[PDB]
């Protein structure tokens, strides 16, 4: 604001605010039993398999 | 007001009231960078300028 008093008319100030990026990591663990992987690729022909 | 008591009458009365203008002055500074002024007036002759 331009003022009408006797003090020093202060110049504007440009601030340079320098931010960052907070990183985060999320992970969940999933077990698969070995008797489940084994009969996934196994050849099947009977109606029970 | 004309009275019926009688103290003295009242003649015609006027008033002349003086007014004036208050002046004001206003200032606000604008800084310029001396490095920013220096590159302005020369001719650009490269894709960087």
Curated annotation (Swiss-Prot), chains A, B:
Self-assembles to form an icosahedral capsid with a T=16 symmetry, about 200 nm in diameter, and consisting of 150 hexons and 12 pentons (total of 162 capsomers). Hexons form the edges and faces of the capsid and are each composed of six MCP molecules. In contrast, one penton is found at each of the 12 vertices. Eleven of the pentons are MCP pentamers, while the last vertex is occupied by the portal complex. Transmembrane segments: none annotated. It comes from the Viruses. The lineage of its organism: Viruses, Duplodnaviria, Heunggongvirae, Peploviricota, Herviviricetes. This is Major capsid protein. Homomultimer. Makes the hexons and eleven out of twelve pentons. Interacts with triplex proteins 1/TRX1 and 2/TRX2; adjacent capsomers are linked together in groups of three by triplexes, heterotrimeric complexes composed of one molecule of TRX1 and two molecules of TRX2. Interacts with scaffold protein; this interaction allows efficient MCP transport to the host nucleus. Interacts with capsid vertex component 2/CVC2. Interacts with the small capsomere-interacting protein/SCP. Belongs to the herpesviridae major capsid protein family. The gene is MCP. It is found in: Virion; Host nucleus.
């Amino acid at each position: 604001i331009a003022h009408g008093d006797g003090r020093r008319p202060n110049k504007q100030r440009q601030y340079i605010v320098m931010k960052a990026c907070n990183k985060h990591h999320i992970g969940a663990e999933i077990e698969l039993a070995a008797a489940d992987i084994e009969l996934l690729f196994a050849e099947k022909e009977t109606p029970l398999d």
